[PDB]
Amino acid sequence: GAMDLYEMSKALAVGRSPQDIAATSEQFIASTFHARSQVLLPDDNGKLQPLTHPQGMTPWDDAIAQWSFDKGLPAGAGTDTLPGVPYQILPLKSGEKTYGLVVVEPGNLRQLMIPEQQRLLETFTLLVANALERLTKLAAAL
Amino acid sequence: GAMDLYEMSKALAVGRSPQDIAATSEQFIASTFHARSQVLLPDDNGKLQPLTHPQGMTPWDDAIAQWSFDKGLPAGAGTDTLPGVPYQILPLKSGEKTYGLVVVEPGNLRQLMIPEQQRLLETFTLLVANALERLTKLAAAL
Known part of the structure; x- marks a missing residue:
């Protein structure tokens, strides 16, 4: 919806941890895009977590997800x-830096792939990346 | 243009100071929206600066700008x-917090006020606010 980006922005603004941001991002991306989603975040070694998938999502290739994160390029x-897979693997990027990924598996792939929807989803991933960037840089500073 | 938000996001990502962010924001908002613009940022006392206007822009009311910043509400x-003024005064907000303002004076006000253009401009102000928030919170941490 028209107001969903703004509403997610308000919810992201008050997130206090990467988990908060991930949960918020999944809630909004799932409702706005009629999809199941999972945010993956790098650990100390730059390895994405979780390695498991939630009930209701098709398993994705963990190594291709890692590729997407490492290269800052989408897959799927x-x-x-x-x-040919029924989901997208999207980097959460701010500038040239990737802070995580979101895997998005829509109920209707033809609907998700409508270009206007893709452009909206890109804006969502930018806002999510900005929140992750803020939290990561602040944690490092502190 | 379709790609301007993403391009501004890349330029904002590498901004190192509020001035960098202000300059980038003015460059992009001015080109994408066919407008002159000025970002105003609060000083130590929460008072907006600059108090002067650049050549080429109509003077705005400094106290109404301060009102917009203080209340986190648009004016103009x-x-x-x-x-009835020929410009917009827009808060740069992330969540409930306002980090600055942008004054936008378009060459063609009827064009700027097209609702689709307003919705795009709102997204631009969100990205600008996120950059200002990141820099302010990092400076405070450090």
């Missing part, structure tokens, strides 16, 4: 890497 | 406060 539907 | 064209 809409790309030439795993073009 | 499109609002019931100074509805």
Whole structure:
């Protein structure tokens, strides 16, 4: 919806931990895009977590997810890497830096892949990345 | 343009000071929205600076700008406060917190006030606010 980005922005603004941000991002991306989603965040070694998938989502390839994060490039539907899977693997990027990934598995892939929807989803991932960037840089400072 | 938000996001990501962010924001808002713009930032006392206007912009009311910042509400064209002026005064807000303002004076006010353009401009102000929030919170931490 028209107001969802603004509403998510308010919810992200008060997130206090990466988990808060991940939960908020999943809530909003799941409702606005009629999808199940999972945010993956790098650990101390730059390895994405969780390695498990939630009930209701199709398992994705963990190594291709790691590739997406490492290269800051999308994979899955809409790309030439795993073009046939029923989900998207999207980097959460601010500038050239990737702070995490979101895996998005829509109830209706043709609906998610409508270009206007893709452009909206890109804006959502930017706002999520900004929140992750803020929390990571603040934690490091402190 | 379609790609301007993403491009501004990349430029904001590498901003190192509020002045960097202000300059970037003015560059992009001015080009994407065919407008002149000025970002105003609070000083130590929460008073907006600069108090002067650049060549090429109509002078705005400094106290109404301060009102907009203090209340986190827009003024100028499109609002019931100074509805007749040829510019907008927009808070740069992340969540409930306002980090600054942007004054936007378009070459063609009817074009700027097209609702789709307003919705795009709102997204721009969100990204700018996020950058200001990041820099302010980091400076405070350090």
